[PDB]
Amino acid sequence: APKVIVFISGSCLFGAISRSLFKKLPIPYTVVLLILGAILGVVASNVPLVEEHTRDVAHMDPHVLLQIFLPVLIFESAFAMDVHTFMRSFSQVCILALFGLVVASVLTAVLAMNLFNYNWNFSEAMMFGAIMSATDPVAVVALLKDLGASKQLGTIIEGESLLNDGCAIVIFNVFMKMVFFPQLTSTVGQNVLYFLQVAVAGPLWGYAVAKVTVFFLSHIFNDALVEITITLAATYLTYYIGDIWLEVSGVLAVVVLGLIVNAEKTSISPEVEVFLHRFWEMLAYLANTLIFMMVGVVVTQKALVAVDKMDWFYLIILYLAITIIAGMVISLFSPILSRIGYGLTWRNAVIMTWGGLRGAVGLALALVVENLAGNDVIGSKFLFHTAGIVVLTLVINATTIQTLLRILGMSDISIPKRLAMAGAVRRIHEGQNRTLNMLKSDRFLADADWDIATAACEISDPPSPREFADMMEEARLRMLKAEKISYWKQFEHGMLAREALRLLVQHAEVAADEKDQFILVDDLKKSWQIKGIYPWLKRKLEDLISHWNKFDAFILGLRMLRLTKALIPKLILVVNGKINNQLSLGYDVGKGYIIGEEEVGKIIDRMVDNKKILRELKHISETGRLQVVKELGLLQREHPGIAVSVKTRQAIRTILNHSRETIHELQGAGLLDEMEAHKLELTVEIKMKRLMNAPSSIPPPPPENLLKNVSWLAGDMKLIDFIKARASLLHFDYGEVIVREGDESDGLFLIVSGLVKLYGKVFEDYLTVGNVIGEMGVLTKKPRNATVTCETTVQVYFITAEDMNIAIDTFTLYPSLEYRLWRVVAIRIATPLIMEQMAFQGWTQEKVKLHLERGYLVDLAESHFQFNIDATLEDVILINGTAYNAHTREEIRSPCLISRTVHKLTFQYTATEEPRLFVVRNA
Amino acid sequence: APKVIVFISGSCLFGAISRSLFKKLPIPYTVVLLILGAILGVVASNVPLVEEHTRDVAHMDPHVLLQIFLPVLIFESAFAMDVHTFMRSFSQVCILALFGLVVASVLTAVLAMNLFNYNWNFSEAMMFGAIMSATDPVAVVALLKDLGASKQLGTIIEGESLLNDGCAIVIFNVFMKMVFFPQLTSTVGQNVLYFLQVAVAGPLWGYAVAKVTVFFLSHIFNDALVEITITLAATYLTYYIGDIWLEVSGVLAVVVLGLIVNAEKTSISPEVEVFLHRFWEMLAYLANTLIFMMVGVVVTQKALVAVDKMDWFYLIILYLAITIIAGMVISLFSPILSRIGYGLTWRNAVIMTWGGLRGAVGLALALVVENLAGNDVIGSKFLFHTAGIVVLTLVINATTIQTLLRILGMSDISIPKRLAMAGAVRRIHEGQNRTLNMLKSDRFLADADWDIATAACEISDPPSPREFADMMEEARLRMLKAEKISYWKQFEHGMLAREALRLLVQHAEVAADEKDQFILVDDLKKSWQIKGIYPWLKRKLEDLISHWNKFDAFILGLRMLRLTKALIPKLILVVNGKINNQLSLGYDVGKGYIIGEEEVGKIIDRMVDNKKILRELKHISETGRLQVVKELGLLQREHPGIAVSVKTRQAIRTILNHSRETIHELQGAGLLDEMEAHKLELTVEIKMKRLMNAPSSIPPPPPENLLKNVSWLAGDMKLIDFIKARASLLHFDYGEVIVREGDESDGLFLIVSGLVKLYGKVFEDYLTVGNVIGEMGVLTKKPRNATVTCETTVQVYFITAEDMNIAIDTFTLYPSLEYRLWRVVAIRIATPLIMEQMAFQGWTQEKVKLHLERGYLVDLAESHFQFNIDATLEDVILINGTAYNAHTREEIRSPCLISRTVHKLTFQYTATEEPRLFVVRNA
C-alpha cells in the first residue's frame, strides 16, 4: 500500500517553517525547500524506512504533473493578475511575448545542440528550450510590491511571464509528443489543423463557457455559496472538456476563463472574489511546495550520480547565455514597440531582462521528461540543468535586483511621499499625545504602569533665473501632489471609478517624471476618443439592415436562419454596451479632471512666491480645462442617448453612495443596530446591482421635459403651465452671436440643444443642454456682461424679462419664484468664496455644496436692515447689498465672505441693491 | 469504468436552481432536491443509459458515508456556532442534551419494538432510535435569524442539536457494530474501556492538538496562507488519528478542535477565520445536496417496492410520537434546570420541542444501514421511514414554526425598533432629497432623465395612577433604549468587548420584557465574582509549593520528574491568565455600565414631565452606580496585580483604537494613499497583537511612582523633586474620618492605597488608588465641603497647602503649576455642563473629553477684564468669577455654560474670585 500522509504533511510543515524564517532575508524561501529535499534524498538512499515513506510521492506518474499540478499553477497565475491593466496593452504585449518566447526558445535549442557534448537532435533541443523559458510572475511581483518599484512595470512583467508560460507549455507538449511517442505521425495538414485548434478553438471555448456562467450568475442575488460552487464547477468542466481533447495545451482555455472571471465585478460579489482568490492561492502554494520537495529529492537521489565537471561548466555557460539572449532580444525588439506606440524605456528594459526568475513550471516539465525517459541519461541531464538554473537564478537575481533597483532609482524616495508620511506621523503623534493626556486624568485608569503606555507611543516610518526654474519645478511638483490628493479624495467619496483613478494617477506620475510637463489634453483624449471605431460602423450597419419575409417564405435545416432575426436586436444592444463602456470612463476622467483642476488652481494661487510662475500655471491649467470642457460638450452633441444613460448612471451612483454614507454615520452614532444597518445596506446593494443592469441607451427627452424639469420651476403645476404658456423657441446657426456685452436684460435663456460659448469680463466658458444663461440680468436688472456665440447649431428656449416679472408678481407663496432664483444665484456665486477662504484639508466640491444646501437665504426685512450676528451659524455670505458696521465703521460690498469676527452690521436701502444674504446655520 | 462527473455536476446545478427558486417560499429547498431525486429514480429504472450514469454514485460504499460525509457535516455544524455562547451555558446544556437524547432514543426504540408488526430485537430498535434522534441546527437557526426571533434561543437550539448529533452517531456506531458484525464480541470490561476511550481520550486528543497548533500559529504574523494550510493539515491529522482508532466515534475529537479554533481570535487573523468558515460551509453544502439526491434516487428505486399501507400508518404514528416524546421530555426536564439555575420558559420550551428538524445525518445513517443490510427488508424499511420523517418534518414544522412564532409573540414588532427604523428612514429620505436637490442644479448632470433618479428614492422598511404606571413603564422602556444606544456607541468606539456588549444587551432586554424591573446590580455581580474560585486556591497552593532539590538528588525513568520543577512556574502563569480572563470582562461590564449611567442621567430628566418618576429613576440608577463602583473598588483592593495588568491593557487598547481612527480620518481626507494607510494599519495591528501577548500579571508600582506620575506633576524634575521633599505619608484604619465638612483647606490629598468614601452636600462617591481630593479647596482657599471616611485601611500622601502655595510661587514658567491645576479642575467641572446642554445624538464621554482637551484656559489679564466673543470658538465655559454684560445687564455666576448668543462681557475684580474661563477654539 502506497504511503503518502507523512510526506505531504511534512512538506506542508517545512513550507510553513521556511516561509516564516525567510521573511526578512533577501533570497526566496523556496530554495530552502529544495535544500531540505536534498537532505531527504541522501537519508532515503541509506535508511530503507525513509525510502519506503518517500518513494511513493517522490517518483510520481508524469500524468499527475501534466494534469493536476500544471493546470492549477497556470490558472492561479492567470487569476491573480489584474486583467484590466493587462487589457490596455493586451495585443501588443501578446505579440511581443509570443515572438520573444519563440526566438529565445529557438536560440537556446540551437545552443543546446551545438555547445554541449551530448548527442541531442532538434526535437530534443526545443524541448530543452521550452523547459528553460517558463519564468515566474509571483516572485518578481512580490519583490516589486515589497520595495514598491512600480505598478506598470509589475503588471507588464506579470503579463509577459504568463504568456511565456502558456506558449512554453504548448511547445513542450508538441515536442514531447514528437520525441517520446515517435509512432504518432502527422502530416502538414494535421499539424496546421492542430495548431488552429490550439490557438482558436481553445480560448473560444473558454470564453463561451465563461460568458454563459456569468449570464447564469447574473440571475442570483445575495447568495455566496451558489456563486462559489457554480464558478468552481464551471472551472472544472472547462478544464475537463479542454483536456480530453487538446491534452495539456487545453490549459489555455481555463486561462482565458480566469481572465473573464477576473474582469466582471457586477454579477459576482466581492466576498466571492476574495474567497476564490484565496482558494486558488492556497492550491498553488501546495502544488509549488510539493514540486520543489520532489525535485530536490529526485535530483539528489539519482540525478547527481551521472554528472561530470563539464556539466557544471555547461551549466554556468547556459546561465550566462539565457540572460544574454533575453537582453539581446529585448534590446532588439524595443525600437519596434516604441514605433508601434508602446512605451518601453531602457531602464524598464534592463530591469525586465534581469527579472526573469525560473519557477516551478520548468521543474514540473523537467520531472515529466525524467519520468518518461526511464533509464536513459537524458532525463538526468534535463533535471540537473533545470534545477541548476532554478537555484542559480533564485540565488543571484532575486538579490541583485534590489541592487539594480536602488542604483537606477526605479523607486526613489519621493519628497512628496516623504512629506505625506511626515505629516501623517506628526498627526498620529499629536493624537496619541492627546489621548494619553486625556487618559492620565481619568477616574479609573489612574494606577496602571504608564511606562508601557508611553512606550506604546513609538511610531516611526523609514533670485537667479535658474532659481526661478527651480521654483517653477517645485511649484509643478506641488501642483501634481495637489492633483493626486484631489483624485484620491474624489475616489474615496464615490465619484471616480477605479480604472479612471488609475488612469489619472498614471498621467500624474508620468507628468511628474516628464521634463517640466503637465497633464496633456492631447494625451487625455485617448480616454474618450475610442468612441469612433468599428462598433459605430457596425451599429450603423445593424440598424440599417420586406426582403426578410420573402427570405423566410423561401426557407419554408435552414429554418434556424429565422433565429437570425431573433439575433438582430441583441447584437445591437451588445454593441451599445461597448460604446457605453467607452463613454462612461471618458466622463469619469474628463469631469473628474475638471473638478481636480479647480482645486489645484486655488492651491498654487496661495503658495507660489513669484507672480509670474503662478500666472503662467493658471493660464495653462485654465486653457487645458477649457479644452477638456469643449471636447466633452462636442462628445455630448455627437452621441445623445449614451450620454444621457451614463449621466443617469452617475447620478444614481452618487445618490446611492451618499445614502450608504448616511447609513454608516447613523450606525456609528448608535441609533442603528448591526441588523438594521446590514439589512438597509443589503437593500442599497440590491438597488446598486439593479442599476448596473440598466439599459445602456436611453431616448433623448423632448425639450418640453427639459423646460418642465428646471431646478426652480418644479414644485407646482401653475408655474410650469404659465412658463409653457409664455416660452418661445429660437433656432440659431453656426457663427451667430445671440446677445452682446452691455446689452440690457432682454430675458432669460435656456440651452435645450447644442453647445454655446460665453466669453467676456477675459473669462470664458462653454455651456451645454440644461444650462441657464442670464439669471442675474433678469433678477437685478443689470445689463448682461458676457457675449454668447453659437459654437454649433443651437436651439434655445427664450423667456422674456417682462413675462418673468409678471410671473414673479403673480406667485407670492413661501417658495417664491424670486426667492428660489435668488437662492440659486446665491449658492452659485458663494461657492468660490468658500473655496478660496476655507481651503483646508478635507473639503471637496460635493461636501461644500451639501453644506451650502443646508443653509438658506435670510430675509432682512424682519431685522430692520440690521442683521444679528451669532456664533451658532458656521458661515454667512453677503450676496447682494452693502453692509456697514458702526463699530470701526467697516464698509463691505457684495460679493464678499465676511470674517467670523464681524459683529452686528446695518444696511442702507437703495434702489439698486436690495439687501440679500446667505447663511449656513449649524444643526 | 465508473462514471461520476454527470451526477455530481447535475446535482450541483440542481442545488443552485432549487436554492434560488425557494428563497421566498416557506418550505426549505432541500425537499425539492429529494423530489428531483425521486424523478431520477423512475427514469433510471426504465432507460439503461440513465441507470448506467447514476448507479455508480447512487449506490456508494457505506464507508464513504461513514468516513467522508459525516465528519464533514458534524465538523461544520460544530464550527459554525459561537463557542463562547455555548460555553456560557455548557453546564446545563451538556447534561440536558445528552440525557434527553438517551431518554428519547430508548423510548423510540421501545416503541419500534412494540408498535410495529416487524420482528425486531433490541439492538436494531436502538439503531432505529439513534437514527431518528439526529436533528439539524442549520435550518432552525436560519429560520430563527430570518424572522429575528431571538439570538439566545437560536444558539441554545444549535448547541443542543450538535450534542444530539454527536451522541446519536456514537450510539448508532455501537449498535451497528452489534448488529451487522455479530462476531465482534466484548465483555463488560471491554465495553467500559471503549466507553472511557470514546468519552475521555477523544476530546482530550482533539484539545491537545488544537492547543499545540494554536501555540504554533502564535509565532506567525502577517501570513495568511501558512495559517490556513496549518489549520487544514491539523484538522485532517486529528481526524485521521481519531478515525483509525475510534472509528466513526472519533468525530468527537475534531468537533472539540473546531470549538477551540472558534474561540481563539488573537493568533488567527479575521481573514483566515472568514476563509475557513466559508470553506467548511461550501464543503457541507456539497455533502448535503449529494446526500439528499442519493436518498431520493435510492428511496424511489428500491425502497418503495416493498411498502404496504400499514407502513404509511406506522409512519404517521411515528411522526406524532417523536414530537410527543420530545415535548414530554422537555416539560419533565424543565423543573430540574430551573432549580439548578437555568432559564427555560414554557414558550421557549414549546418552540424548542417543535423546532426539531431532521436533516442529512439521519439520512446518511439510514443509507449506511441500507447498504450494509443487502437484500433484507430491514434496509428498505429503515430508509423509507427515515425519508418519510424527514419530508414530513420539513413540510410541516418548517412552515408552522412561523405561525407559532407569530402567535406566541417571540419576535413582536418592538416600538423601540419601530422608532429607530422610522428615524433612520426619515434621515435617509432627507439626505436623498438634499443630494437630489444638489445634483439637479449641477453644471454637467443637467440632461439625465430625472424620473429614474426620483424613482431611486423609493426606500421603505416594514393623570390617573394607572396612567402614571403606564407612563413610568414607557419611561423605563425609553431609559433602557438609551442604555442600549449608549452600549452600542461605546462598542463602536472601541471601548467594550463583544462579550461585554452581548452581556449588557442581554441584561437590557431581560429588564425590558420582565415586569417593571431594571438592570440589577445583584444580577450584574456574576460578571466579576467568578474571581474567587478554585483557580485562586490552586494559585495559592502553587506559589506555596530545598525539598525539590533533595528529591532530585535522591532520584540521581524518574529523572524526568525534574521537569516537574520546569512545570512549576508555567501552570502558575496559566492560572494567572484564567484570572485575567475573568477580571477583564468584569471591568468591561462594570466601567461600561457606569458610563452608560452617565448618559441616562443627562437624558431622562429632560424627558419626563412628572418630577416623581424621574426622581425615583435617578435615585435607583444612582444607588446602582454607587454599588457598582464600590464593588469595583473592593475588587481592585482584593487583587492588585491583575487589576493593574487589565488597566494597562485597556489603556493600550484605547490608544491603538484612537490611532486607527486617526489613520482612517487621514486616509479619507486624501492625504494618505492606500499603501501608506495599509502599512501603518499593519504596524498598528502588529502592536495590538503584541499587546494581546502581554503578561497577565504586573507587580504593583510603589507609592513613589504614583506620586511621581501625577497628571500635572510630570514635565520637570524640579517639581517632582520638591514635591517628594515635602510629601508626608499618612496611615488610617477602618472607620476613621480624615476631614469633615466645613473644615479649612489644610492641603491636597493623594490616595495611593485603599478605598475611601467621600460624602457631603446628599452626593457621595468612592475613590481609589490614584485619585486626588481637594484641588478646589487648595486653589480657591474655600473651606472643604465633603467629608471623607475610610472604607478600609488606607495609606495617603498628604501635602500641606502652605507648601503648595510656596511651590506655586516658586515655579512661574509657561506651564505653571497653578495653570495646570486650574485647567484640570476646569475640565473636570466643565464636562457635566456640556453633557447637560449638548445632549445630542453622537457625543460620548471620550469625544467630549478630547474636545475639551483641544481647548485651553484663557487668561483675562490681557483682555482687561473684558472678554471678546467670537464665532470661531465652539464653546466657552465660565469656571471662576462673575460675568456682567452691559447689554441687557446680564449677570452670570460661576459655574455656567453661557449660550452661544452671549456677546462681549466685562468682569469686576474681587478678592474671592479671580476671573478664569475655558474656551474650545476650532481647528
UniProtKB/Swiss-Prot annotation, chains A, B:
Q: Which GO terms describe its molecular function?
A: cAMP binding; cGMP binding; potassium:proton antiporter activity; protein homodimerization activity; sodium:proton antiporter activity
Reactions it catalyzes:
Na(+)(in) + H(+)(out) = Na(+)(out) + H(+)(in)
Protein's name in the database: Sperm-specific sodium:proton exchanger
Motif Essential for sodium:proton exchange: where in chain: 164-165
Q: Which residues are exposed on the Extracellular face of the membrane? A: 47-62, 116-121, 177-187, 247-249, 305-309, 374-377
Q: Where is this region: cNMP-binding domain?
A: 718-799
Where, per UniProt, does this protein localize? Cell projection, Cilium, Flagellum membrane
Location of region: S4 segment of voltage sensor domain: 557-607
Q: Where are the transmembrane segments?
A: 4-23, 29-46, 63-79, 90-115, 122-147, 151-176, 188-219, 224-246, 250-263, 271-304, 310-339, 346-373, 378-408
Family classification: Belongs to the monovalent cation:proton antiporter 1 (CPA1) transporter (TC 2.A.36) family.
What are the GO BP annotations of this UniProt entry? potassium ion transmembrane transport; regulation of intracellular pH; single fertilization; sodium ion import across plasma membrane
Cellular component annotations (GO), alphabetically ordered: plasma membrane; sperm flagellum; sperm head
Q: How is its activity regulated?
A: Gated by voltage and stimulated by cyclic nucleotides which shift the activation voltage closer to resting membrane potential. Not inhibited by common sodium:proton exchanger inhibitors such as amiloride.
Q: Domain text from the record?
A: The dimer domain comprises TM1-TM3 and TM8-TM10 regions. The dimerization interface is formed predominantly by tight interactions between TM1 on one protomer and TM8 on the other. It contains an hydrophobic cavity that accomodates phosphatidic acids likely playing an allosteric role.
Q: Where is this region: Transport core domain?
A: 90-177, 310-408
Shown portion of the complete protein runs from 74 to 1192 of 1325
Q: Which organism is it from?
A: Strongylocentrotus purpuratus
Q: Provide the membrane topology annotation.
A: Multi-pass membrane protein
What does the function comment of this entry state? Electroneutral sodium:proton antiporter that regulates intracellular pH of sperm along with capacitation and fertility. Activated in response to egg-derived chemoattractants, couples membrane voltage to sodium:proton exchange and transduces membrane hyperpolarization to cytoplasmic alkalization to cAMP signaling and ultimately to sperm motility.
Give the residues the record marks as binding 3',5'-cyclic AMP: G774, M776, G777, R784, N785
